[model samples]
Target: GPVPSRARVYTDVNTHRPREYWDYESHVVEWGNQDDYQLVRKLGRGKYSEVFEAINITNNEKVVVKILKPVKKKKIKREIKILENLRGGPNIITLADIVKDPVSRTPALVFEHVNNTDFKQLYQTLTDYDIRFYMYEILKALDYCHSMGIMHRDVKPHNVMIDHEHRKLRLIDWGLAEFYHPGQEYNVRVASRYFKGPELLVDYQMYDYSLDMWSLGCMLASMIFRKEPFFHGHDNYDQLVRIAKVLGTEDLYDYIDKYNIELDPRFNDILGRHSRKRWERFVHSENQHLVSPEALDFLDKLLRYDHQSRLTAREAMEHPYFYTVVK
Candidate 1:
């Protein structure tokens, strides 16, 4: 048995021996005692969970340990069910084991740990051509998921990890993902604010998987600019204003109205905002000189004002921008 101290453990509680207080110890005993796995280091943390790199001493294999923060039992159970039902692809993270905490009474999911860095970090070293190739791979992954009826609501750079050796991209963080039901609108506003699509900002209840396409556009724009596509604002209204400044208010309004979509109060200012000429000035001032024509065209289609007019992951994958790097 491996000693608990030798395992790389991350605990929500501030104590040094946090694992001793975990509530799932008893349930996890069957797989291996705390001695069976060694915690390597902290991978990352989110609002409801923290992930760590760990090694199973028995097999000497690496894995990701995702421990959910204390939450309602029902929500934990729901998450487990969703994770359990998730099918696998090269682009999707694979689940290895599930365990319960003994002291904290929380659930922990063990996943095949990926060694690559997320897009957020990768963008720093990527050239324009590199970005083009990377984006295509990402779209390919999303296309696969969408074909399976899985809508990855959060498609930001941070959730995309890359394996440079294999030139592959893997999508992570499916906590907000849902099964797409055609003709039935999903009334949920769930995703990182900066990467969220106009449809989600205007009426989350009416948005579809298309929102993920918008997020991908934002990420691509950010990669080109080497900055967030929309300024990081503290609130929804501020975020939308930043987005409007880049995309143009009049054009956005026309696009929205054409689709018979209503703007939420947070974005209502779009109707009374500046004219197209003024909007263009703002957008050009920030990005005109920096973005390539191919990249701009890709962003335009993905960031279309009308959700209905936005490209699907599959369509975006086939766009010429992706072909730019192909022989």
Candidate 2:
């Protein structure tokens, strides 16, 4: 799914909601009259916005209304454009409509309101088959996004919603998403610290869509073992240490040399001189066994020390782990 030309038109910051704008009614279009929808309850809240469940009076359909702060117009607009570019499918969240606040002029995205809770909250209640099914569905959605040149920068469990009654999984939240082609250059300062890839930690300029793959791997692991995160550190240096501890010091050294990247002095303390067991403890620890074999295999390819060696979403789906579940 290539981004429509109209989507590019809104990228210009100057064309964004001007400071003089006070009412969204002047700039936004409401699907139906004010009496057409009734706001019921608040769904959730994020850094800059809140989501509420609303019902369309005409059809009595449930919808999610994400209302952003007026100050966050840029992010809201970008999210709208990103959602517009995304092609709808079974595994992906389907965008319904977009509404704007008449007073503050903030944007609100109306989506197909799912009754299911997020994967993070659902994991405790999931059976073994549920985990497998969740991973399978998520990977399928990611594969589709990759095919369309879009990278879902955030792929954590919280972003994966499950339709409990229907037993379906949907990928939500494209707030941090970006477009990436073979030769396209993308800024690296994206994704949460714990889920960021090595390239992003070392150099954001050279980063690519592989970051998503890394997050997917981390999410899969987290769901199975309930690990806080593979990389739980205070800073970039600490994160690198965590990475080195899992992938081995030799692998880290080779990666630094291969990419001409510099390493922080902290790396030496953890790895020591000529030590080959940097990641020995993690891979051999009791927690290691908590991960399913198929999940581990997929994780190995996703979390490679070298970005070039990471697997693509499509290739990951082709891996034996995905097929082994039903066999």
Candidate 3:
């Protein structure tokens, strides 16, 4: 038996577009010359690639060189295709070029450099206004992507690069992003554990762009509450526990019931009943400056147990919390 579900908004975005738009597998990439870019220094390594800071020698423009680490050609193609599809999107990372080692055949992606300050240090220095401004920018990116029938799939702070001095934000890392189609059952193994949505945890496969909203909720919650990770789960199971501890257990059951979802057998022992915790309960003297009725109201709408109950990116942008920070 299967339950029916879809994104509350933009459910048929891909339907209107041409087949070539969503059929990424058939797209051929036009590779660029790696010699034009000179490596500056290593930025960091990711699960799929080794990243570096580089200079586009022709123009002396700073750029990022993300060398792909031997994954399926399809995976690489998908990232490139998604980036191509979302080119010039609001606050989206600009892909400058795609290059491959002439001999080694190691593929690399070149992107416009963003002068970023690590969130761990940068977030501590942000004022309440700063948080609102940056968050609004994030919403802009989400709304734009959803409008184009794409789900970020990975929407954590790590994927959001902030150039605080210029007040710039770029939603990067399209490696995990995918096009949306109504009634599609996606792989539940997509987002990171700490930011995973209830639908993902409950094994609801027919998720859509709203999955990013849940991850965005976790990011927003963490930034406002001064918690590095709002949900501190050691494992996927504990991840749900941590969420239930905050969002409560009873409503979770209601959500599952509505969807006709069967709880994973593993949750039998660990999933004890928990009363819902109020949004206000998370605010304290330390985070008082960041706490407000508008902020709380917005968070409440986002952290709901039911995916359909969560706010759409467009709807979220219209929420009162972002009234002053409107586009």
Which candidate leads the pack in lDDT?
3
Clashes of 3: 0
| TM accuracy, model 3 | 0.98
TM-score of each: 0.78, 0.79, 0.98
lDDT of 2 by residue, 60-90 (tens): 9987777776654455555665565564754
lDDT string for model 1 (107-152, tens) is 6777777778655567777776778888887877777666545568
User: What 10-residue stretch in candidate 2 is worst by lDDT?
Assistant: 1-10
The clash count for each model shown is 16, 0, 0
**After superposing candidate 3, which stretches have Cα over 4 Å from the reference?**
none
The whole-model C-alpha lDDT of candidate 3 against the native structure comes to 0.89
- How far is each candidate from the true structure, as Cα RMSD in Å? 12.1, 7.4, 1.1
Off by over 4 Å in 2: 1-35, 71-74, 264-292
Candidate 1, TM-score vs. the true structure?
0.78
In terms of lDDT, model 1 sits at: 0.66
Cα lDDT of model 2 overall? 0.66
